[PDB]
Amino acid sequence: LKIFFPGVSEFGKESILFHYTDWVDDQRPENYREALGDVVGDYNFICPALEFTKKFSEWGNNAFFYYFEHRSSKLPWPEWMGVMHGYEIEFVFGLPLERRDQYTKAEEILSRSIVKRWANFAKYGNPQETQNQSTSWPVFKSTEQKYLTLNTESTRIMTKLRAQQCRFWTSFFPKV
Amino acid sequence: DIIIATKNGKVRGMQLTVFGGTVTAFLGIPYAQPPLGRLRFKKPQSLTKWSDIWNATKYANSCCQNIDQSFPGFHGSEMWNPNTDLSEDCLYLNVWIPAPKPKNATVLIWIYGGHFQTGTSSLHVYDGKFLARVERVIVVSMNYRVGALGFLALPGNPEAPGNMGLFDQQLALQWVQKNIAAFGGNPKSVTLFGESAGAASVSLHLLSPGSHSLFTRAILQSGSFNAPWAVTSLYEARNRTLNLAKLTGCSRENETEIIKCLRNKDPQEILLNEAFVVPYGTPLSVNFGPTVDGDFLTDMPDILLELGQFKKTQILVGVNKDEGTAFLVYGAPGFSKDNNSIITRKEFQEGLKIFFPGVSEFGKESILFHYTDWVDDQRPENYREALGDVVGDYNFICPALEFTKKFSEWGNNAFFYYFEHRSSKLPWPEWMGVMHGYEIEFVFGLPLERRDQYTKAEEILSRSIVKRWANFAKYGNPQETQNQSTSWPVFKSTEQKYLTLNTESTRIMTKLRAQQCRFWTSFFPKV
Amino acid sequence: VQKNIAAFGGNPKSVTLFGESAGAASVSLHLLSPGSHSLFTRAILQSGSFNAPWAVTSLYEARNRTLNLAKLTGCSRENETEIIKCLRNKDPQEILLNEAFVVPYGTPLSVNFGPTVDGDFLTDMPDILLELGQFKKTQILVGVNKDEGTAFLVYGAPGFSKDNNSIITRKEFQEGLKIFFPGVSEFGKESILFHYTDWVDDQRPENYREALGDVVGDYNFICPALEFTKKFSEWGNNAFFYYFEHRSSKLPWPEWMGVMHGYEIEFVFGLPLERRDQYTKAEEILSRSIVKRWANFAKYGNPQETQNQSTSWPVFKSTEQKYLTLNTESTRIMTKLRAQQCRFWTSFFPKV
């Protein structure tokens, strides 16, 4: 935390450890490895993205939010790193559509689907895949805060991503 | 030394040490006349007063039943076989109360499953001492008649009117109304709970007028009476009573003549013949179960459900992630508990023949169409997974979801859970997942026992489920209010919010198995 | 009262409980106790509710204390009835003398022996009953005083005195927290100072004196009263909330103490209605008005003063959270008392 929150008061740093190290539970030897990743990702990316999305949509425009959760089968980084920063991109540009290229069948299908939704958003303002009996992407409203998950297995409509974590980053942390 | 005076006389119990505290157990209190001789196949009769201290210090006889001999020496299957002598003299119940003796405690009444052909209140996964200790509720459970001895029907005729095992359960609830205040319990605060056929039973007490005033609320784990296995048509029922007659050389036809012959026969002959009353059974067959008797059940239950004719109260309903797997190893080809069970297209089709015996060709193609549109790779376990899901969706999950909507549409609060944790002690192999029946040890709190092998995270899940169950019984609302828990939203058709139960993150989700149940619920009943 | 009050001219069907502090916490527990449901109609809670952190003893602390009392009186045994019987030989003084020491660290707010979950009067942890709507359904009237905390600062906070202005330092404030939050982790205590010492602004030499009073009053009285009021009203009953802000002109405590804990009471019982007695005219009028509203609440479930063109007392709803102020000058309808402070006490603090 000292590396990521250089100065940042002592109390600020204790706050983070308090919020993120109330274990459920066993120990669970990777507990602390997981917490630090989540701290860095929640503060820097996920909470500011969710706060942007609410504030924007409160002025009456349609907004769509996704939670990308597929780990590339070609990721050269090790497994504890999971679905890393930057590794949706090859999916959005369609590299798994190339058969010559090592990706799984199920990865081809996820890319084809993401490519379609991106394009429908650009052409028509609405990121649906309309033909292959796909899960319908609900708009984001503060209040409900529905988002769509992107993965090879089952895509889901979920609500209030990282609710408890972002209350901390967004309401309490800017104070310290 | 610790003795309680009931309406029918004194009963002695026994002290138990549980987590540094004490629970009083009254094991094996009789609740009806032994149903022997001229009383076989009749409704339970009420008990004559004893002067005596009746000694409720050991579990009592289980009811007569066929036993699962498919995997001898295997804990996975044998933990469900009866653990007391079998005997027609089996109408007994158990009471666990906390110590110190409570003032006006909520009562939880457990009704076991077993497809109405099997089961018993004395199994270690139904031991209520943990709930009494931890939540200070009183736990009661009863043995009720199963198989022909419990559900043989010749409708209208009181020698064998049908539904005797359900009247057994009823008569026990009656005993709680009349006697539980003597034990420190509140007859005005009773929640029924049960699993599988036990759950289907709870659902029928919601529909039976004679049961309306004998409980407050209800919990249904993996079962509801609209499951395709739960109610026997009046037609199938006579065909079966008549086939049983034939098989025992008891064919007559002053129909009371038949029943009387059947009362000379002894329990073994009856039990041996039960399996063959149907031309094709399945691993899910209920040869003898609930019927429309015009007594316990006044009309076809789907109709009562649909038209709002049931007790108005809160319900808590749930199912397990892999309800179907457990049944695949009792006759689907290419399945085994001792390997990974990768099956072929061809094995899947025969599998459907085993589970959907007749069932037209087109019906069976429908199922394969709905469930084998792959996403995608192949994925060698595709067909193994589809068959489990077929069996679980049809038999448990969709009927539970349809029950929950129809009930809640008449304006009561309903709560739905999707249980998704695999026990770390499960003796069945991994491809079987979160099997039918394996939430129960969590609900009764066995992981709260530290001596016992479960993980820390399993202890915490059990403590949390126990709390929510109890809050539901006492207050009609299954929240865990203190440990910053996920709030359990009510089920409404429209939203259809349910809660997931697992060790990692519990979630609010919507429309469980939406695409699968449209198929089972709207299209399949047509074929 | 149920059995005998009709003989005196009273209506057993129209009984309102009222009380202050622990008396108020008591009223709140009769709202939760089934044996009390049929022994009153309505309830008034002045500066107290059972969810205040001082009001209920855990089953654990309670045995530790009963056992410490045994030790201290040379009554340690352990056929536990043996303990009680020894304690009945002791005489009241020995018992009273020893009470203070049953806890390792008390505070000026310590309740050594108080309500517990007995499985009789109280069937479950009261927060749970509150949260799940298990209490008598009826109207409540709930309130607090502007300076609930000050009175306690002179029973052990350093740099405080009833005989001077009590300007304390940063350092005195921190030790003050040590006195009131005995253990309470270091981080918990820093949290409090962070929430309450972000100054607006000048310095303002009484800053730290004011913060400590507010800390004690917010944690112990005001936030638990507001949380009680929301949770209760969410189950559909009318609730009325007041913020009492008048300092008695006869208060013998000094001025920095303000509108202290306990000093609404003489107003509610009508002592300023006595002309012989030193109170101002404007104090007479405030008392006459409070007396009327209390009585209208008891008789009719609605604390209005209907004749003298008075400010109309709106019901409390979570969402709006309207409350009425009581003072001699202008009575006001205001919203969300102590909003920013209670978020801290109610959502963050129970975690630490």
Ligand SMILES: *[C@@H]1O[C@H](CO[C@H]2O[C@@H](C)[C@@H](O)[C@@H](O)[C@@H]2O)[C@@H](O[C@@H]2O[C@H](CO)[C@@H](O)[C@H](O)[C@H]2NC(C)=O)[C@H](O)[C@H]1NC(C)=O
């Ligand atoms: C209604 O009754 C008959 C009864 O048939 C059965 O006789 C029993 C004693 C038993 O041994 C059983 O195995 C036997 O089948 C059923 O008719 C039977 O149907 C099958 C399958 O189509 C035929 O091949 C049988 O030979 C035929 N038997 C006889 C004697 O006619 C009928 O299907 C059944 N329906 C039920 C129980 O739901």
Ligand SMILES: *[C@@H]1O[C@H](CO[C@H]2O[C@@H](C)[C@@H](O)[C@@H](O)[C@@H]2O)[C@@H](O[C@@H]2O[C@H](CO)[C@@H](O)[C@H](O)[C@H]2NC(C)=O)[C@H](O)[C@H]1NC(C)=O
């Ligand atoms: C998994 O096992 C099944 C189940 O039946 C078998 O139990 C095994 C442990 C095995 O040792 C075998 O001797 C026993 O019969 C296998 O299904 C069987 O497959 C065989 C040939 O392998 C067929 O000819 C049988 O009809 C069929 N038997 C039964 C009783 O249904 C299954 O093939 C095997 N699958 C694996 C290893 O993936």
Ligand SMILES: *[C@@H]1O[C@H](CO[C@H]2O[C@@H](C)[C@@H](O)[C@@H](O)[C@@H]2O)[C@@H](O[C@@H]2O[C@H](CO)[C@@H](O)[C@H](O)[C@H]2NC(C)=O)[C@H](O)[C@H]1NC(C)=O
């Ligand atoms: C639960 O019980 C013990 C009891 O300790 C106390 O003994 C009493 C008779 C009394 O005189 C009291 O002053 C004394 O502390 C508590 O353990 C104590 O904790 C303190 C502070 O950490 C230690 O420094 C003491 O020496 C220790 N005493 C002993 C004898 O072990 C415990 O904290 C308590 N908890 C409660 C009452 O909430």
Ligand SMILES: *[C@@H]1O[C@H](CO[C@H]2O[C@@H](C)[C@@H](O)[C@@H](O)[C@@H]2O)[C@@H](O[C@@H]2O[C@H](CO)[C@@H](O)[C@H](O)[C@H]2NC(C)=O)[C@H](O)[C@H]1NC(C)=O
């Ligand atoms: C206000 O008074 C306090 C309280 O204690 C004191 O009472 C005073 C009226 C005074 O006459 C004094 O003799 C008596 O102790 C003062 O706190 C004290 O400050 C002294 C030095 O002034 C410290 O050394 C003491 O530890 C502390 N005493 C106690 C008992 O807590 C306080 O300083 C004073 N403040 C003013 C005038 O603003």
Ligand SMILES: *[C@@H]1O[C@H](CO[C@H]2O[C@@H](C)[C@@H](O)[C@@H](O)[C@@H]2O)[C@@H](O)[C@H](O)[C@H]1NC(C)=O
């Ligand atoms: C025990 O409580 C009785 C009523 O309590 C229940 O009220 C029901 C309607 C239902 O809500 C339950 O869940 C409640 O707990 C009361 O009438 C009895 O007098 C009480 N008996 C005692 C204290 O001995």
Ligand SMILES: *[C@@H]1O[C@H](CO[C@H]2O[C@@H](C)[C@@H](O)[C@@H](O)[C@@H]2O)[C@@H](O)[C@H](O)[C@H]1NC(C)=O
């Ligand atoms: C006295 O009044 C009795 C009822 O009056 C009360 O009704 C309650 C429900 C409650 O609203 C109170 O605040 C009401 O004042 C009545 O039944 C008695 O008969 C009366 N007794 C007499 C006149 O002697």
Ligand SMILES: *[C@@H]1O[C@H](CO)[C@@H](O)[C@H](O)[C@H]1NC(C)=O
């Ligand atoms: C959907 O259908 C087929 C797979 O059967 C696929 O080849 C096609 O490109 C898919 N389209 C999209 C947008 O995913």
Ligand SMILES: *[C@@H]1O[C@H](CO)[C@@H](O)[C@H](O)[C@H]1NC(C)=O
């Ligand atoms: C019942 O159990 C106790 C054993 O503790 C015994 O003393 C009592 O008389 C027994 N009654 C029997 C065996 O009938």
Ligand SMILES: *[C@@H]1O[C@H](CO)[C@@H](O)[C@H](O)[C@H]1NC(C)=O
């Ligand atoms: C919640 O808190 C603690 C774990 O810190 C646990 O021991 C307690 O029993 C829990 N209660 C419930 C209902 O889960």
Ligand SMILES: *[C@@H]1O[C@H](CO)[C@@H](O)[C@H](O)[C@H]1NC(C)=O
């Ligand atoms: C209101 O009117 C007069 C003051 O003009 C006063 O004497 C009377 O008692 C007042 N009533 C109340 C309820 O305040």
Ligand SMILES: *[C@H]1O[C@H](CO)[C@@H](O)[C@H](O)[C@H]1NC(C)=O
């Ligand atoms: C056939 O026999 C009985 C004698 O048990 C007789 O009363 C009646 O005539 C017939 N049965 C019925 C059920 O009516």
Ligand SMILES: *[C@H]1O[C@H](CO)[C@@H](O)[C@H](O)[C@H]1NC(C)=O
């Ligand atoms: C210890 O002593 C009492 C006698 O007062 C006796 O009845 C019992 O065995 C023990 N106490 C309790 C509370 O059971």
Ligand SMILES: [Cl-]
């Ligand atoms: Cl999809």
Ligand SMILES: [Cl-]
């Ligand atoms: Cl939600």
Ligand SMILES: [Cl-]
């Ligand atoms: Cl133990």
Ligand SMILES: [Cl-]
């Ligand atoms: Cl799933």
